[PDB]
DNA sequence: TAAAATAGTTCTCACGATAACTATTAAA
DNA sequence: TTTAATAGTTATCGTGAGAACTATTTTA
């Protein structure tokens, strides 16, 4: 068999269903990094998150973080506000729609594990995760 | 929550493979370009159209169309209209294509061996049906 | 103060998705 | 032969990457 190809395919379909599922459940656009950042802002309302902080949370690059915050703004999930102390920093803030969505989305996450990890065991699962961990760790 | 982490671990995986391949003179082929070059090599007696690539790689119509444009630009393939069916365009490995399939097949071997080191088979075979289940679950 | 770390943007790109469109062949 | 299906392209988009570029702190 082949390991590079299969993996890529399996993710492409998985990614594609999550998009389908999430539109029907009224969390369109959040199956992905947008949803992950909305969740992070929710869980931690006390911390200032700047754009750079998003790079590190989501494990993405400069340009990717910049373009991602732009998309979230266009979608109404966030407001971007320059800092007054550090003139180069821009802060991110969940909007009202943002806050409402963080909630609908947390439900959706629950309904996912409940549906996609059916027929699988936590040992089976814990081992695949070590299968994965070591794959990872193989690239120093 | 953890399902996110999944797509992260792909982003690194995808990222390293691109570094590895360029270092090893198979640039641009860690990915669908490489997978299609292989398919053409392994089967030189089957004529393959752009649509056939949609099916081999499980991609959409436009993804396939754009992908072949990228391979042509890279030198790995030539695109030739069918003379029987004026709708169809056939794909053909170029000379550079053919040699790359070779260096790439080597790359695959090396990568596989260096990635599944310290891992058993049942562990790996169970990872499969754990993954096949997920896929099956999203049906 | 001069030089370097930092925060963000914009360029060009690879690789995925739809949807709307042109052709062309096949089917009814 | 009117209609369906098929093959490919191009539009807009989401989500990844690096590189070159501002503009602001640091810090040496």
Residue numbers in the entry:
A (entry chain B): 2 to 141
B (entry chain A): 3 to 141
Article sentences:
In the present study, we conducted structural and functional analyses of the heme-responsive sensor protein PefR (porphyrin-regulated efflux regulator) from the β-hemolytic bacterium Streptococcus agalactiae, which is the most common cause of life-threatening invasive bacterial infections (e.g., septicemia, pneumonia, and meningitis) during the neonatal period. Therefore, PefR promotes the expression of these heme efflux systems in S. agalactiae in response to the intracellular heme concentration, likely by binding heme. This architecture of PefR is similar to that of the multiple antibiotic resistance regulator (MarR) family of transcriptional regulators, in which helices α2–α4 and strands β1–β2 form the DNA-binding domains.
Lys53 (in a loop on the edge of α3), Ser62 (in a loop between α3 and α4), Ser67 (α4), Arg72 (α4), and Lys75 (α4) apparently help stabilize the complex through hydrogen-bonding or electrostatic interactions with the phosphate backbones. Under the same conditions, the K53A, S62A, K63A, S67A, and K75A variants showed activity similar to that of wild-type PefR, and the R72A variant did not bind completely with the target DNA. These EMSA results suggested that the interaction between Arg89 and T6 in the minor groove is essential for target DNA association. In contrast, in the apo-PefR–DNA complex, there are direct hydrophobic interactions between these residues and there is no space to accommodate a heme. The Kd of H114A for DNA binding is 25 nM, similar to that of wild-type apo-PefR, clearly showing that His114 imidazole binding to the heme iron acts as a trigger for structural rearrangement. Given that the side chain of His114 faces the solvent region in the apo-PefR–DNA complex, free heme molecules might easily bind to His114, with His114 thus locking heme coordination. The distance between the Cα atom of Lys63 on the edge of the α4 helix (recognition helix for interaction with the major groove of DNA) and Arg89 in the wing loop of each subunit increased from 31 to 52 Å and from 54 to 76 Å, respectively. Given that the distance between two consecutive major grooves in B-DNA is ca. 34 Å, the increase in the interhelical distance between the recognition helices upon heme binding can promote the dissociation of holo-PefR from the target DNA.
